[PDB]
RNA sequence: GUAAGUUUAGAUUAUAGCCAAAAGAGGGAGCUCUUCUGGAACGGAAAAAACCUUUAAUAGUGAAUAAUUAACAACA
């Protein structure tokens, strides 16, 4: 046994590098348009 | 109009749209061509952090360097002793990934980890529901446990 | 139910892939339902056959006495014919036997993907 | 002569209770047992919720790429992929590029599967449908 | 990838604005879609306590 | 068009089978947005009302901002757990 | 390592490498007029994006994008090869 | 197929059910009786002691299933 306290462990996994390919955000997988035109822009 | 011709309408055409697959002969060439490029990538070692999925016990653990994994049972292995995981179905790189069918060849992937600690789980209260329960009808568990630290992941261009 | 159900016909033979000659020797039976709330005669037969646990394979002889017992519990069991593609296992190969879901007991387990 | 400590055993579990329950042994003992039983029942149900959460997250990730969860699972099964739902959630969150590759793989098998189903097996099995 | 922690949290937890046209459209089908978008169920990391709902505009 | 999904948003997915046939190779290099398909950064450079203003800014309920009694305030855990 | 003025430092490295200073562009925009605006700013070198960062304001996104570029410059990518402690040699 | 059984001696406990569903009998509704069968979830039928799925209970951030409110105007 180690000196670490014996109590409930919330998560059985510990990692210092959770993501390798990058964390997903809503703008991921969203296609751009020519000139980056925002929606409903008349131009 | 040709015989048995149905004009397109709401009900004449199915909602789903038919697709056409590429011809097999050229498809294999693309399959082989892609493999050759990847084989060079593995040989050149053009990758950094890697993630590998390993199935241990009844659990599947996505694993990376320095990861800590806890197993809720004894293992009989001394602490500080490196161990090789033999069940890996997937390994991933920054710009490519490999998928087992259903498992990767032992030659391609070798994964090693070290045993950190042997411990028992925190107490777990068990008390069944019953009329006139009484206070002494309760049980504790503290299921044994073990700690594993990921050490290294080794791959080779053996496609 | 007519007795023809247990008297097979050529069409039934083709459907289930069973040869009218060389009748199969052994039955494979598994309990698929609970005996709770069932009459005592059903309960007694299930215990006698040993199908206490559900989804547990049991091998039985295809003999008239056993067939009568299986018929009583027919609704609570699934019956499959055991097949020996490689024949009976030997003493040396007794440790390499494996029973497939198809109903075939192989006498050699090579741990190689069939693919 | 240890009756005081027996009450302390109930009290120590009842220190965090509110109202006269925390200071009345008659009520404190009942509350302590009720609290323990509630945890016991939740243990079995707790596991089921976690799987439900994992499945729900997978569906949103699959729907983000335009793939239905049932279709994605079936095609992966046809490909002999046995990654668990918990790992699948992590892959989408932490390996979005891999998830798209998985999404592309499942869709390609789905296209091959639809072709195979329409073919009825007369046509040769597809490259991605080969076992 | 390689983004700073605080900006990374902001982007993933950000809420989006959506526009819907109701002309000759069944409200119920729009409501089913609107509920999905409004509740935040369209996000892969949806959690009950994350308050990840999104803005929906209907015209 | 070997890939079954559009490759123009996240990454170029190239699916391949290894020579042995018991492995699938996926190559996924990321795709960058075209210069033409983006815009340049913009070159030009009381108690009751307080809760209402707070509610309006964050689209929250007014009930959220009301205080709580001493009983619950003391109960709050002072040390939220954070590892790494 | 404390780095102030990331944009200036990024430009300083680029001129040393004889690389054109990237042209900042607004890759994505959301909730601009709300109290919680999200801006994505991408650094485009020779009309090619080198690094992109998210920010609540255009300035914040540009600063974050600069920080991302600096990590890329010095090979500190999030996906970089992990250091190895296993080697007995 | 299976492992109890017969006899001798000592000795108590028990000697009041509940509800569903079957089979009868008075009766002509429904009631009124008698007989046989089954039951006491941690799942489901909404809340449902009595119906359906359910062999015990142990830890696990595994897996396959069971039962599981739902159904798709008339003219010759």
UniProtKB/Swiss-Prot annotation, chain D:
Claim: Hydrolase is one of the keywords in the record: no
Family (UniProt): Belongs to the bacterial ribosomal protein bL20 family.
**What gene does this protein come from?**
Mrpl20
Q: Which GO terms describe its cellular component?
A: mitochondrial inner membrane; mitochondrial large ribosomal subunit; mitochondrial ribosome; mitochondrion
Show the CDD domains listed in the entry.
Ribosomal_L20
Subunit relationships: Component of the mitochondrial ribosome large subunit (39S) which comprises a 16S rRNA and about 50 distinct proteins. Interacts with OXA1L.
Q: Tell me where it mainly resides.
A: mitochondrion
Question: One MF term from GO for this chain?
Answer: rRNA binding
Localisation: Mitochondrion
One Gene Ontology term from the biological process aspect of the record: translation
Can you name this protein?
Large ribosomal subunit protein bL20m
Checking Pfam families in the record gives:
Ribosomal_L20 (PF00453)
Taxonomic source organism: Mus musculus
Q: Which UniProt keywords apply?
A: Mitochondrion, Ribonucleoprotein, Ribosomal protein, Transit peptide
UniProtKB/Swiss-Prot annotation, chain E:
Where would one find coiled-coil regions in this protein? none
User: Looking at the UniProt record for this protein, which Gene Ontology cellular component terms does it annotate, in alphabetical order?
Assistant: mitochondrial inner membrane; mitochondrial large ribosomal subunit; mitochondrial ribosome; mitochondrion
Q: Name one GO biological process term.
A: mitochondrial translation
N-acetylserine modification sites are 1
Portion held of the full protein: 2 to 60 of 178
Where does it localize?
Mitochondrion
Q: What is this protein called?
A: Large ribosomal subunit protein uL13m
What are the record keywords, sorted? Acetylation, Mitochondrion, Ribonucleoprotein, Ribosomal protein
As one GO molecular function, the record gives: structural constituent of ribosome
Q: Which family does it belong to?
A: Belongs to the universal ribosomal protein uL13 family.
Source organism: Mus musculus
UniProtKB/Swiss-Prot annotation, chain F:
Which GO cellular component terms, listed alphabetically, does the Swiss-Prot or TrEMBL entry include? mitochondrial inner membrane; mitochondrial large ribosomal subunit; mitochondrial small ribosomal subunit; mitochondrion; plasma membrane
Q: Where in the cell is it found?
A: Mitochondrion
Gene Ontology biological process? mitochondrial translation
Lineage: superkingdom: Eukaryota
Residues spanning the signal sequence: none
Name the keywords, alphabetized: Mitochondrion, Ribonucleoprotein, Ribosomal protein, Transit peptide
Subunit architecture: Component of the mitochondrial ribosome large subunit (39S) which comprises a 16S rRNA and about 50 distinct proteins. Component of the mitochondrial ribosome small subunit (28S) which comprises a 12S rRNA and about 30 distinct proteins.
Protein name in UniProt: Large ribosomal subunit protein mL42
From Swiss-Prot, chain G:
State the superkingdom: Eukaryota
Subcellular localization, as worded in the UniProt entry:
Mitochondrion
The DRBM domain, residue ranges: 5-75
Q: What does this protein do?
A: Component of the 39S subunit of mitochondrial ribosome. May have a function in the assembly/stability of nascent mitochondrial polypeptides exiting the ribosome.
Q: Which family does it belong to?
A: Belongs to the ribonuclease III family. Mitochondrion-specific ribosomal protein mL44 subfamily.
Q: How does it assemble?
A: Component of the mitochondrial ribosome large subunit (39S) which comprises a 16S rRNA and about 50 distinct proteins.
Protein name as catalogued: Large ribosomal subunit protein mL44
Q: Give the originating organism.
A: Mus musculus (Mouse)
Q: What is the lineage of its organism?
A: Eukaryota, Metazoa, Chordata, Craniata, Vertebrata
Region of the whole protein represented: 232 to 320 of 333
């Amino acid at each position: 046994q180690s000196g670490l306290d014996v109590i409930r462990i919330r998560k059985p996994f510990h990692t210092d590098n959770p993501s390798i390919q990058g964390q997903w955000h809503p703008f991921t997988n969203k296609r751009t348009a020519l000139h980056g035109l925002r929606p409903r822009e008349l131009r | 109009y040709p015989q048995g011709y149905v004009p397109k309408t709401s009900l004449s055409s199915p909602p789903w749209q038919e697709v056409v697959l590429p011809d097999p002969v050229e498809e294999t060439r693309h399959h082989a061509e892609v493999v050759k490029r990847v084989n060079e990538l593995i040989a050149t070692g053009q990758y950094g952090r890697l993630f590998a999925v390993v199935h241990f016990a009844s659990h599947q653990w996505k694993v990376t360097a320095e990861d800590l994994i806890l197993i809720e049972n004894e293992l009989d292995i001394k602490c500080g002793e490196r161990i090789r995981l033999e069940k890996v179905l997937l390994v991933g790189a920054d710009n490519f990934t490999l998928l087992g069918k259903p498992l990767l060849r032992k030659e391609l992937v070798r994964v090693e980890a070290t045993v950190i600690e042997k411990t028992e789980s925190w107490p777990k209260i068990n008390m069944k529901f019953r009329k006139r329960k009484n206070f002494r009808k309760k049980k504790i568990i503290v299921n044994p446990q073990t700690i594993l630290r990921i050490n290294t992941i080794e791959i080779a261009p053996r496609l | 139910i007519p007795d023809k159900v247990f008297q097979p016909k050529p069409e039934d033979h083709e459907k289930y892939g069973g040869d009218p000659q060389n009748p199969h020797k052994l039955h494979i039976v598994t309990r698929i339902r609970s005996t709770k709330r069932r009459p005592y005669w059903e309960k007694d037969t299930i215990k006698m056959l040993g199908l206490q646990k559900a989804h547990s394979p049991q091998i039985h002889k295809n003999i008239p006495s056993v067939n009568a017992k299986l018929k009583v519990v027919k609704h609570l069991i699934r019956i499959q014919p055991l097949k020996l593609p490689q024949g009976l296992p030997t003493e040396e190969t007794m440790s390499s036997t494996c029973l497939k879901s198809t109903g075939e007991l192989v006498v050699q387990w090579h741990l190689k993907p069939v693919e | 002569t240890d009756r005081y400590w027996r009450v302390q055993e109930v009290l120590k579990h009842a220190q965090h209770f509110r109202g006269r329950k925390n200071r009345c042994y008659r009520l404190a003992v009942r509350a302590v047992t009720r609290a323990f039983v509630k945890c016991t029942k939740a243990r079995r149900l707790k596991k089921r919720n976690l799987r439900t959460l994992w499945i729900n997250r997978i569906t949103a990730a699959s729907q983000e790429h335009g793939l239905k969860y049932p279709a994605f699972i079936v095609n992966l099964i046809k490909c002999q992929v046995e990654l668990n739902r918990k790992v699948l959630v992590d892959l989408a969150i932490y390996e979005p590029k891999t998830f798209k590759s998985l999404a592309a793989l499942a869709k390609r098998r789905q296209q091959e599967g639809f072709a195979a189903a329409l073919g009825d097996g007369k046509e040769p099995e597809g490259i991605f449908s080969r076992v | 990838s390689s983004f700073s922690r605080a900006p990374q949290q902001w982007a993933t937890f950000a809420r989006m604005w959506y526009l819907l046209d109701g002309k000759m459209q069944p409200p119920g089908k729009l409501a089913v879609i609107a509920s999905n978008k409004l509740q935040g169920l369209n996000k892969p990391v949806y959690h009950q306590l994350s308050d990840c709902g999104d803005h929906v505009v209907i015209i | 068009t070997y890939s079954s999904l559009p490759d123009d948003y996240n990454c170029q997915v190239d699916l391949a089978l290894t020579a042995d046939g018991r492995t699938i190779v996926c190559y996924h290099p990321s795709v960058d947005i075209p210069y033409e398909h983006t815009k340049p950064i913009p070159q030009p450079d009381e108690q009751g009302p307080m809760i209402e203003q707070l509610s309006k800014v964050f689209y929250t309920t007014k009930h959220r901002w009301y205080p709580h009694g001493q009983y619950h305030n003391r109960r709050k855990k002072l040390n939220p757990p954070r590892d790494r | 390592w404390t780095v102030v003025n990331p944009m200036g430092l990024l430009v300083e490295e680029l001129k040393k490498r004889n690389i054109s200073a990237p042209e900042s562009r607004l890759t994505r925009q959301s909730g601009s007029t709300t109290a919680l605006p999200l801006y994505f700013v991408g650094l485009y070198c020779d009309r090619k994006l080198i690094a992109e960062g998210p920010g609540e304001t255009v300035l914040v996104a540009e600063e974050e994008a600069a920080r991302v570029a600096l990590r890329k410059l010095y090979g500190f990518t999030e996906n970089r090869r992990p250091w190895d402690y296993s080697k007995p040699k």
